[PDB]
Amino acid sequence: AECSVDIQGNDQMQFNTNAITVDKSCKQFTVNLSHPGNLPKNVMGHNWVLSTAADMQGVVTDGMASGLDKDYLKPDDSRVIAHTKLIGSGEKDSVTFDVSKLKEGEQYMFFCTPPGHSALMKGTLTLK
């Protein structure tokens, strides 16, 4: 409903949006991630990861280094505000997070951390 969004990552390393708006009065927000296509998780897995704009580089750098078995996220990374798990084609995962984690006027970015994906699979998240 108003406090959720559906996003897709496909076999061509595309998310289907580059901008998410969250109603600032939502108590929680949910992202429902899915993966059209047929490529398996070990080839074309995707996740959905939220951080500040400033933290994204570091999250991506350490995430890509962390490997498939760690969903390409640094374990215990305090910069990651919220994340789904890593999913392959035909799979689905949802994450819910507390909108009080987020500041009106702050610049947030969502992105996919797997090797080769983050520059191609990113966007803004902003409160309205």
86 touching Cu ion, by CB under 5 A: no
112 touching Cu ion, by CB under 5 A: yes
End-to-end CA gap in the chain:
16
Q: How many chain residues are in contact with Cu ion, going by CB under 5 A? A: 5
For residues 71 and 61, give the distance between their C-alpha atoms in angstroms, rounded to a whole number.
13
35 touching Cu ion, by CB under 5 A: no
Nearer to Cu ion, 50 or 112 (CB): 112
Q: Based on C-alpha coordinates, what's the Rg of the chain?
A: 14
Going from the C-alpha of 24 to that of each of 12, 30, 53, 63, 125, the distances in angstroms are 32, 13, 18, 29, 11
User: In angstroms, what is the minimal distance from the CB of 41 to Cu ion?
Assistant: 10
- The residue ranges of DSSP E strands in 41-117, in sequence order, are 49-52, 82-83, 92-98, 108-111
User: In angstroms, what is the minimal distance from the CB of 114 to Cu ion?
Assistant: 5
Nearer to Cu ion, 1 or 73 (CB): 73
Q: Binding site membership: which residues?
A: 46, 112, 117, 121
46 touching Cu ion, by CB under 5 A: yes
Stretch of residues binding Cu ion (CB under 5 A), selected from 30-38, 46-54, 68-76, 87-95 = 46-54
